[model samples]
Target: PSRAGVGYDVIVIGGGFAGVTAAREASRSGLKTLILEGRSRLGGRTFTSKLQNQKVELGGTWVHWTQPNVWTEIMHYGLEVEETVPETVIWVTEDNVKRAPAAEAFEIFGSACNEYYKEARNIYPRPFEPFFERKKLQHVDGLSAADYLEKLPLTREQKDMMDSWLSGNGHNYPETIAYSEIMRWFALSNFNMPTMFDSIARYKIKTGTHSLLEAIMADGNSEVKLSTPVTKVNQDKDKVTVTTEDGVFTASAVIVAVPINTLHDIEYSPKLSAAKVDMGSQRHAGAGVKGYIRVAQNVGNVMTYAPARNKLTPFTSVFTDHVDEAGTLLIAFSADPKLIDINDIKAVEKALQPLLPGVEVTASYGYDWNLDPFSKGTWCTYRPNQTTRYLTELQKREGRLFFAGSDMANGWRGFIDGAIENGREVGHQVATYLK
Candidate 1:
């Protein structure tokens, strides 16, 4: 459908990291660019809210100096960094009363996971490579994370400890999650080593990821329309038209920056490829939840772990670096929707008391991206088959519709660095075509 506004040089959909970068690059190149973001706010999965007079990140939070694109933005925007020191002391219990040394428990769990990746080395070129062919990656995909873990030569105690660690971030119980995807994250995050993973999680933004995103948006003269959800994208040899809630918009070219899952919601005139459609439908958009809880006591800077029991208690690891003498702010994560009720603060508090011996949760808040209309989930994570069949297909350009997001990125698949890298690379390509 056509609209009254004159055609712009470029139009971008979704205003997350990728969309923001596309808008900035297009406007900087002197093109008349427009960005239509479905969400009410700028950051798609990244949000920071003020709790107890201190900024707390409820969505995408951590980034490191090692990640060039994100690092550059951090420096450019003058954003402060808070160290995520390691303080994870594991405690394993059987009868709900007995506890074991964290070191012994950690070693048992770590050994099994290490073997999980080590055995996978034969199937993949690198750890991040997921077999796309049904026959190739199917064996691994056929088994759930729990299935694979059960196959491991770990004892009951060891299995319980590993489940505790994986449950916290993965959100789902082991039986529900895919092992190949879990291994993909393990390899992508640097070889399943605690030090490497810890380094990756070393620093977090003082304010929020939006600090950097807003800086990028502020640098450009692009017209940004918030709460404008794109419904249809019509394109031909000459131009592209994007229909949003506000109205239809025309442009010479368009950048499709929404998550893979959300792509199917918008009608494409010529229609996207079956491969792209399949990828969008099949891939997981990080079905997890992250929350910030305030306690009256001090939880040392480091991660703390407890055995996974209840669905809400599945998050065994809690990042407490943000906690301090003033009030402890713990970053708790879970991958399942049933475990976390984003609207209920009491549930989050109850989930914490089991891990923190004497700590009292005063207040808490979180955003469930899984239920959010625009994003639909947290960060992007590829299923086993998707990497083989659709990685190149989804990341490839289709006519005037170019895709960009952290999920599309190669180096750092689920991190902010990947998002920035994707933005810069796609920006250059799109700029050349627009020029």
Candidate 2:
């Protein structure tokens, strides 16, 4: 791409929540701001899909008041919550056989999971804490999610349940994820115990999370260049030159809001620190498959399935109660992308049949974000020790270059709220710099 020296007070890269908010806030502060987005659509990780005429979230779904950035948007715009009625009762299973949910088993299993976080908390109060103080986790950073889970003395059935749940979210099976990083994420989310994590609820947006992006666009102060990929950011002592597919532009400062996994794609003239590069390379970008299934019958509760010895390609450990409808609207998640090819329309039907014995799958809708060119993976969550090693560097401003993304946010690291917070924070800093 050739360089075309178009200047702006500020340039925001990536059109996710962070990029939008940064551009909006900079404009609000009386600075001429421009937003450059690589994707055709906004909302970043929160991609929406339609199935059976129902809206389904294929990316970042669910936001609650617990998340401050999203809450601020909700209050600012008078947006109401879109409540979904929970329908499925949750259960546990092993070897495809339903296990009795005795309080004792539940407590023990829950505690074991919780213990993982308790140990992590002792090392770092929150994930943003310096990693130098928590060298203990360094040893486990190389271990996969499954490697750590196996060390716990849970029963075969309990292990299966744990695998199903963790693997579903981790994208790569348990063995591929760093155990320390998983625990760090749990600790950052305030999940100290297994039961506490279990209480985690999903909240839907009344107007849709994308509505926030639309509202930001309606502000109309910044010029947005869509379908523009930033290939390099060359920062001189005075101004930063951003080279994109369309052309190059000079800005007083540039805020990079891309995902951590794709950070290497955008070259920095001087090159980033080795720590930042390593963090990007080592982090897990949440490459799992999660989507909703519309069923013909109303299943009253959430059900879990784990098949015996079938540790591979199992989707049983994670299922959610139907939402937004009175009937069976099963939301299922699986880490095994291999299930996409199986002749198993029965996979979902068979699982739901136990909960809604006669229910049939009317339709299934989902998207594989991990494979998307724009996203590459779902969301940014770091591996063990990365919190201490790279979080600060990633957020640090290098000359005229700044970083703003959900991943770089100090709070709620990988959540949308974090993205907003980082944008606003960087916007203020950039505004100050311009003045």
Candidate 3:
């Protein structure tokens, strides 16, 4: 660590995957790096905690080998993933809710996704380079998930299944998210419904996300300042000055790795670009609810889903997280936070009755990132015309300042993998630029 007058080579803001990876790469490259994290703890939106004596992740959890960015890190860190194979699957239709074996329901659910993303293969020919085939997607870029769903001749169950499934990914109702976002995800998952279902979720780190986060931190020489919110970033030709609540630090280069929604809070000298400012206000739609519910009985690998539009089901999706003598812990998610008070045991119990059918909710836990000042939302999800309009401009560097986050990832945006991918990429970009 050095004095404020003695500037480091690089400074990173935000301690999420993006900031951590950026710091790790820059520091290891022989450049002194510093990370300013506002929170007392790290891992930003990704959190691992205990509920009912069971290890649970209240924020982002699932990861798979298919996501290349995170796969490389897990492989490097010697981390293994455990599979989550649900034995029974429950879903809602127009007239009635149906509970069936996973074997039968999986086929139906996968096909529903297949039907909805039929054009994805052609539209997103290059998975990582989403705009590589810009011509193919221009007509549909403005389409919402709801708009695209109506174009398909689907059964009632199929439509509802698609709505709930996409909502779970978007962290919002379908009508609010762009159809191309799902299209990009589908293409990234190898344009197969079964693969999409498996890769996007179905797999998580065996030791929890914090293990990997700590590993990345221990490997880096970067100095970290916690509970230090960055108030201003004023860049001059020689160096970038970062003013925190209490002190100021200078760096040759700076990377702002915070969420797009909260990016507006920071005061930037010479003003940030118009597109970045506008997109900050427009923001991605990922405000939603997630919780870990411990039940009295072993649920035996169950998964349930109800339409996000169905306000009666605050929890749009619930999956069997862990099963033991202590009781089964089910991790649930909803597109809207107003649907239920996820922290309340009674409200969660009542909400689960319809999905689990008489299951006793013993304990529950949740974190509303929407209410959290650091992160105004859960994950990144683009609305109609947002992707093409803002993606390029947002990722561009201005003067000595650069930006990196899951929101700016070319692939797997809004996931842990995206954050790491962008962090690594931007870290190298800034590091090389400095040398």
Candidate 4:
């Protein structure tokens, strides 16, 4: 069943957490494994860079104790974490721009969230098992965040708050994000908003995510090829041939762990399933931009929120990351792919003026993940009706071509934890198949 005498037992086609973990697991199980990463680095979408002599994450920044898989890795590696204080104030720009105490704003937001996700506990009785209540899910899985909000009796201010929160989750318009997707987060956080925010955005890897990535790569015995872009994957009854910019390699099995948005870019012989092709063509809803802006003024522990398509601001959410004698470093997120120019300092300043008001931007750093050939988008955020429609089908293995990513994870989908979980599960499945 081997080709060319040196055929690998496994070939993983992405160096992200999922691919690395799968390769690690397979290799640990006595399989000869190899990892092909298109980027020159190993972390995939999680990139760590320096700004003002301080470490800043350009992508996939935070990790929390609540995320089981990632938390276990932290414990395994003995990794330390740093925490950011809760926001002291919140500025909301909706029908009117106003500033309120963080507690007050959060209270309003929480109340609205309660109403919006009123049936989350009932619908997702088992958060990890997303489809546990299949019949009940069909009733709400097709609803968009906008649709759910419309059904609720909320004030304009509250509606704007919901829009801001939903936009941040999907990194897109509220109308485009699925109601079930947001409900999953609520259920995962034990049906609480503050807990969800604390888990999702509060704590970060102290030594930077690259450190953890390096630890996982070092633990795995798989051979790795950097800057090798895979173009085609051809599989037969016996083996799978992977075509890359460097050349071709054959393996007993292949794990495709790339982002769902870029899955369609690779050619598959015998073709992929119609569902996979359709899902790839449809793409995920996480096409947004995340960046850091350093300002001369001390913004303190301030957080800002702006509803989707706010004419005066492109920022959906902005929060203080670090504050020191030098200045204040803030992290900003926008669902609009074309909203801000990260490279243009002046453009960034203009975009933040509405939220910060008169603050002078001294420096900025970020990457356009949507435009990146490798990622084509940020994280996984399903569009309306996509959860029930594609989640299970997308996870189905295509013969020897197995698919795995945070995009299709049963829990923590679109997070680092989910990626690790999917990788571990797929790696076990592949190992069993080989046996």
Candidate 5:
């Protein structure tokens, strides 16, 4: 009702990695900033939790030094990492849960990835500039992971590795994941599978995501309203007003940093661009379930992979984070929620039965991102044809509103690094605009 309602210079709409980085940058630039988060705690999809009397990640996890932005943050904060050095590697095939040296297994996996992403270097000369060779992907962008993997002259075991790795990335079958997106990752990972795998799952924040998040927040020195979910964003020619169930707030500019799937939940005056709206309708294909299980045996550190083709095992990937008093704790993922339920201990035990012989699951924990009201999915993967058609469209700015999210980052689209990359970019963009 009064002009005093315009209390902040910038208001970040979500509290995930992108929103946090944007808000931090805005405040650091001397602007009055506010972060409105729906959840009680921040960190967005990267939820820090306690399971089996030890720290665990209920959502987004893992990072690598190769990823420039997130890596910079890690170094800036002096955070240590816990490496995922698995002692035993398992390849779950149709009739056997094959075991072999991690070196041999990864070599097979790398070769399969090489065959599929041979041209990725040309397509992504600069990994951060994913569309560097925009026209080069004209013929390849339309194919799904299935379409490409089917054409490669790889062994059955090698092909299985491709499906298992890519399926775990998209949380869907090879038929749904865009081959171009996988190429972007390979390109970003120095165009090698072993490095790519390490860049993704090998190293994680030792102190946890929230630890680093708090450090950034302290530096930004901004206001944060937790459990405060915004419902509407209305921008006039001069100012932007936000609406929540409780009250109203205004800012000189706003950053819409929520997941693409949940974009439709909030009302936007003048409506969002058609592409953003349509993205809310179709959504990305990363709704996989992440499960953490405590086994009866102290099976040091271990890793396992079950191909998407193995319909009997929906849990495509598993890795032992750390063994504790509770037993061996495994971080596992299922491409399809229809097949495996993370909360169901019995169901999870069945899925892990073949991957880790004789090991029994004692306790299980997971946050079903697929059904969460705020996130509707875990990670981000462009569907076939979605990348070339909608990747750029989803990022177009409107009025005083700018968008940032892991889903739309130019590089590392679905990882924490990409989220920070976009946030850092937008944060600087808004700061310069206001300067």
Candidate 6:
């Protein structure tokens, strides 16, 4: 086949933050580059959708100043951020839904987290370098969040409250999420629950994820092909070839920036290493659901928490995004794919009745990341023992093939900031390899 208009210095697969950042960095390094995105639009798992005539995130959302890489971009683009007002929290118990003052609830929650993450700073001395004490991490990495929680001398209510947050981390049960994953986040937030919580769900991009995605693409100046899904990648001694629905493209090196869960979808020539295959097969624990609900009742700055896999509530957490004359706009999440039908307004109302009580849901919309062929999951979170076992191997470069994604990030592994961080690092490495 003719290689005209196909040859390039580098080719990046996936158009999420990692892919765009890598493409931009490669172009900045004076290399010819292209980005192939399967979806019609960019941002991959971080999609901004229209709901109730307002922009809402259907996938990954929220960003903070503590996230260095994403924050850098925000400042560079002069993007404004908005903060959620302090909330009045509700905790759903087995018997009833109890309300607490925001300050008191936060204090109780913070203490629980502090106790749960005791000695986190020492275990993860360098949050950015997660494996700094590789030997020590192995001892704890094998433990699930449930395993650690069992050892704590907390009351049943405390454990339930903590599970609500932990389940949201992996979009699954606590036993399915690794202790190391939460520990890393705890250390990264300087071992303070308030700080950690603030840095996570407190702030967001004022414009939307699409605005930042556009800014990154504009800066990259690399050729982009949207609605193009890669089927196969073949690499020989001198060149790498990518197969798509349209045709084949050649490059000196290739960056696979797709989510870890969907990596197995693409066929790789000569096959990937055993480690990469195993990691892909095992998959991460971020598959779940995220959505927005418009309710007729105005719940000003309300926050709700429900235990993992609770029959009365599929929503692990729900926070008020906005409140106006129209009523309340809330952001809700769930790890249990079987609970509520994201497309059915009635199902959402039924599932949320326990938490919202008399609230009437006028509209509800969400995306099932678990069912998305391209994403296969919402964010990256290692299962028990998976961290010490596969993290380094997942990030290691294979012949003419490099991996880049927030899933493989050294810091903020499941965050957009982490995606950019990995992209920048891998792009530089690829540039140096070509030089």
Model 4 segments more than 4 A misplaced: 1-6
* lDDT by candidate, in order shown: 0.70, 0.67, 0.88, 0.87, 0.84, 0.86
| Candidate 6's TM-score | 0.97
Per-residue lDDT of model 4, residues 161-246, tens digit only: 88888999988888888888988888888887768988889899999888888888789889999999999999888889999999
Residue-pair clashes per candidate, as listed? 7, 14, 0, 0, 0, 0
Instruction: Flag regions of model 5 displaced more than 4 Å.
Output: 1-5
Better candidate by lDDT, 1 or 6: 6
Q: How does residue 421 of candidate 6 score in lDDT?
A: 94
Which prediction has the highest lDDT against the true structure? 3
Error of 3 at 123 (Å): 1.3
After TM-score superposition, the amount by which residue 335's alpha carbon in candidate 2 deviates from its true location, in angstroms, is 1.5
Q: Write the per-residue lDDT of candidate 5 for residues 1-435, one digit (tens) a residue.
A: 113547788889988889999889998888888889998889989988888577877877789978898999999989999876566688876645787878878788777776888888877889777567778876788889888889989998888877888898788887989888888888888877768878988788999988988888887967989898899999998778999876788988888999999999999997888889888998898977788888989888777888876855777888887777768878888887887888988988888877776788888888988888999988998988787788788987788888899889988899998899999888888788666
Cα lDDT over the full model 4: 0.87
All candidates' TM-scores?
A: 0.86, 0.84, 0.96, 0.97, 0.95, 0.97
User: Where's the lowest-lDDT run of ten residues in candidate 3?
Assistant: 1-10
For residue 413, what is the lDDT in candidate 4? Answer: 94
**lDDT at position 167, candidate 4:** 92
User: Ranking by lDDT, best first?
Assistant: 3, 4, 6, 5, 1, 2
Regions of model 1 farther than 4 Å from truth? 1-6, 75-79, 86-88, 91-105, 119-144, 283-285, 299-302, 306-314, 342-345
What is the C-alpha RMSD, rounded to one decimal, of candidate 1? Answer: 3.7
Give the residue spans of candidate 3 off by over 4 A: 1-6
- Give the C-alpha lDDT of model 6: 0.86
lDDT of 6 at 329: 87
lDDT of 1 by residue, 13-73 (tens): 8888888887898788888888888878887777777767877666777786546688888
Pairs clashing within candidate 4? none
User: In candidate 3, what are the lDDT values of residues 1-435, reduced to their tens digit?
Assistant: 232454798999999999999999999898899999999988999999887666777788889877898889999999998876578988887735789999898788877776887899889988889789887777788999889989988888888888888888789988989999989888888887778878877888999999989889889999999999999999988889999997899998999999999989999997999878988998897999988888998879999888887745687899887687977888899988888899999999999887778889888888989999999999998988888888989999999999999988999998999999999999999989986
Candidate 6 per-residue lDDT over residues 406-433, each given as its tens digit: 9999999999889999999998998888
